[PDB]
Every structure is written in C-alpha cells, then in structure tokens.
Symmetry: C2
Subunit: 97 residues, 2 copies
C-alpha cells in the first residue's frame, strides 16, 4: 500500500476553484479499482494550505491513477491556482495489510 | 473528520513490541463506530520511523477513542519503545464530508 501526502498552497482568491477541481479529482479517484484513500485536508492554521492523503494498493495503481482523465485534468486546472510547487511525502502502508 | 498524523521513532530492538502495540490499537480502533481511519505507515527510507494516520467523525469520537482499553494499553507501553518524543500534526478533514 503506497501512500502519499501532498501539500498544495492555493491563491486566496482561487480557493473556490481549487475546491471544485479537487471535488472532481476526489470523485474520480475514489472510484478507481486501485484507490484505497483519497482524503482532502486543510492545514489546521493556514487557510490556503491543503493536503491530499492518497493511498493506492501498490505503485502500479499509482501509475494507473496518473493516466486517468480526472487526474490529468486536475493537474492542468490546478497549475495556475497554486502559489508554488506541490510538496510530496511518500509513505509505505503497514496496516491495513 | 478530525484527522491527525503522528510520527514515532522506535528503538531498533523495540520495533516488534511497537508492532504488537499498534496491531492491538489498530484492531480495536477500526471496531470503534466513530473511527474513520487508522492507518499505520512507515517511512520510505528510515527503518525505525513510523506514522499513524487517524481520523474520527468528531471530537466526541476522539474522546471515546482515548477511553478505550486498546488506546490505554498503547499509551502505557509506548514510552519504553521510543527514542525521543512523538510529533503530532492535526488536520481539518474536508473530504469525505459536506464539501464533497
Ligand atoms: Cl530495556
């Protein structure tokens, strides 16, 4: 089980659009055969800092995710909404397992 | 969702005891009606660094969790296991939730 936590910093005046983009990504991603989690989180104190907790069965499912129309559209639409590059931390799942 | 991520560094010779403790915490927690996630993760590279990702429906459910035998056994047994103190991050859970 492959997990990633991705930090995204969003332009204050674009939060509404960011939420729309991630609603579409979340909806598509939770429907994928190899998806296990797709949680959208906010920083406890920074209103424009979000974290996406995504987990997939394995790295093959991650690769599949990155081929999907919803992921590719999100990557496109997210780019201008952000104040800087995404930061990603990878983890390996132990439980469930 | 009330969400937290906790980082724990475990003494090399205590990793097995850490797994025993977290297995029981994981099992009991996923049997809590108010629990939504209890994922036990490990660092990509550092063999003794673990993370626990936990989510609960609300603050009452977090509080319930902290009264359970499985949590309390974890708390008791945890100090002899670690090299230094745990680090905890709290997150605001937006999806799944009304924002979906
Ligand atoms: Cl000892």
């Amino acid at each position: 089980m492959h997990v990633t936590l991705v930090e995204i910093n969003v332009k204050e005046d674009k939060v509404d659009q960011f939420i729309e983009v991630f609603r579409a990504n979340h909806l598509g991603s939770i429907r994928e055969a190899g998806n296990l989690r797709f949680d959208v989180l906010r920083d406890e104190h920074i209103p424009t800092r979000f974290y996406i907790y995504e987990a997939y069965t394995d790295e093959a499912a991650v690769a599949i995710h990155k081929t999907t129309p919803h992921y590719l559209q999100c990557v496109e639409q997210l780019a201008p909404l952000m104040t800087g590059p995404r930061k990603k931390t990878v983890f390996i799942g132990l439980m469930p397992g």
